[PDB]
């Protein structure tokens, strides 16, 4: 049932993810240091973390089968709109339900509600984000499923500004069908029960998170002294 084209897709995506996701988190040392101790104390560190994570999401995206047949303008629009969402999705790998934190290997790099709050965010974003993390983590995805969902998130044809939507859809459709078929052949029940649908629902939850994030961004953004603490990439991508 899983064709050779579909096995190839999955193998490309697993490797691309491995090339762009370091589970030792060694590069975190290059970020401006976190400060816990002060309302925006964590902002430099998390801005840096986000900025790096944008870079890695781009590196992953470039490797998506089909992505390179898209025009530059379309590449750009897909990345601008999906970046935060893929960062949210990829963060699930460090997210632990033990204490509802993202644990990047050491206490310095273990982030919780109060760390995020000290980056200029409120429960308007954080509560539904931790709920996302929890509900995503409970799906217990195979890594194969994880990378397919991130790819499907990026190659989304309804993002506004998209020119060649039909091309975006054919690409996305190839990855949806690979994901559908993978779950059927490799995901045993009961974990497979309604699993595609539950994954598609998470992409819907990410639309709402993206919305709220863009709103908090605009607010922070309006204060030139905080906007100063960001990075040039983050300013370019998040506007």
């Amino acid at each position: 049932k899983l064709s050779e084209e579909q096995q190839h897709i999955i193998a490309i995506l697993l490797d691309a993810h491995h090339k762009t996701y370091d589970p030792t988190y060694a590069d975190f040392r290059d970020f401006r240091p976190p400060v816990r101790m002060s309302p925006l104390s964590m902002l430099p560190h998390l801005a840096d973390l986000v900025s790096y994570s944008i870079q890695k999401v781009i590196g992953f995206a470039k490797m998506i089968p089909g992505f390179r047949d898209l025009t530059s303008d379309d590449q750009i629009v897909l990345l601008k709109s999906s970046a935060i969402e893929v960062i949210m999705l990829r963060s699930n790998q460090s997210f632990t339900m033990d204490d509802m934190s993202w644990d990047c290997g050491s206490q310095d790099y273990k982030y919780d509600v109060t760390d995020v709050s000290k980056a200029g965010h409120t429960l308007e974003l954080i509560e539904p984000l931790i709920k996302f993390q929890v509900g995503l983590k409970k799906l217990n995805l195979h890594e194969e499923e994880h990378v397919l969902l991130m790819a499907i998130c990026i190659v989304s044809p309804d993002r506004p500004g998209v020119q060649d939507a039909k091309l975006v859809e054919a690409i996305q459709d190839r990855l949806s069908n690979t994901l559908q078929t993978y779950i059927r052949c490799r995901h045993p029940p009961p974990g497979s029960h309604q699993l595609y649908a539950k994954m598609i629902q998470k992409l819907a939850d990410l639309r709402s998170l993206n919305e709220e994030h863009s709103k908090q961004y605009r607010s922070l953004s309006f204060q030139p002294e905080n906007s100063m603490k960001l990075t040039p990439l983050v300013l370019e991508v998040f506007g």
Partner: peptide, 11 residues
């Protein structure tokens, strides 16, 4: 477009 860094990282 005015997205030079993102253009550059995509090429």
């Amino acid at each position: 477009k005015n997205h030079p860094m993102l253009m550059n990282l995509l090429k």
